[PDB]
Amino acid sequence: SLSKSLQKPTILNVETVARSRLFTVESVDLEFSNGVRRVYERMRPTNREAVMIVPIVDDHLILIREYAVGTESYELGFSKGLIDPGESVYEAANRELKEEVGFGANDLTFLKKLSMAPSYFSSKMNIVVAQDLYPESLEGDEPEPLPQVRWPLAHMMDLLEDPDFNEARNVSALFLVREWLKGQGR
């Protein structure tokens, strides 16, 4: 038969089937274009977005060490947080830097927006590069201080040899910033 365009399935029903303090899982009844019915599960859709900041000062990246309960270990990577309602990406980035690393930035650049496993989650991550930093601290919600790690741009790619850093958002960010740095040749 004739090749045809994509046709999204119709959502027959959506029901909350489990809720924790931070998670709300929904059961979604679907009917695909070919009439096949299936029940999928996903995290309740939200429009709350995240921001990840990549600070560069004196030819070094500023990374942080942060506990992750999912793996029960310390990850090495870029500062991340949520964009509060009403805030632009630049504003959330500046606020998160101040709260996590004690600096604000006069030069913030929005490089890319990414989704993460959209089959189950609808969250987006905005990658921002921060330069021309100045000291300024804000109170965050971290239970413990976030140790900072200065990493030379010239050896940026060595971060891929550290399993504590090898997380999809960190790796995507690393390569996107390097591409951007090439643009201006710095």
Residues that bind a second copy (CB under 8 A): 6, 8-9, 11, 17-23, 25, 27-28, 30, 32-34, 36, 38-43, 45, 65-75, 112-122, 125, 143-144, 147, 160, 166-169, 171-172, 175-176
Task: Kindly report the length of the chain.
Answer: 186
Report in angstroms how near the CB of residue 106 gets to a second copy at its nearest.
27
153 binds, among ligand APR, a second copy, none (CB under 5 to 8 A by kind): none
Q: Is residue 7 classed as helix, strand or coil in its secondary structure?
A: coil
Q: Has 96 been labeled as part of a binding site?
A: yes
CA distance 3 to 83: 42
Contact indicator for 116, 125 with CB cutoff of 8 Å:
yes
CA distance 2 to 81: 48
| Residue 151 and residue 72 in contact, taking contact as beta carbons nearer than 8 Å | no
Q: Is 41 annotated as a binding residue?
A: yes
Q: Minimal distance in Å, beta carbon 179 to ligand APR?
A: 28
Q: Which does 149 bind (CB under 5 to 8 A by kind): ligand APR, a second copy, none?
A: none
Q: Binding residues for ligand APR, per CB under 6 A?
A: 22, 40-42, 69, 119-120, 141-143
- How far, in Å, CA of 59 to CA of 137, rounded? 22
Residues in binding site for substrate: 41, 119
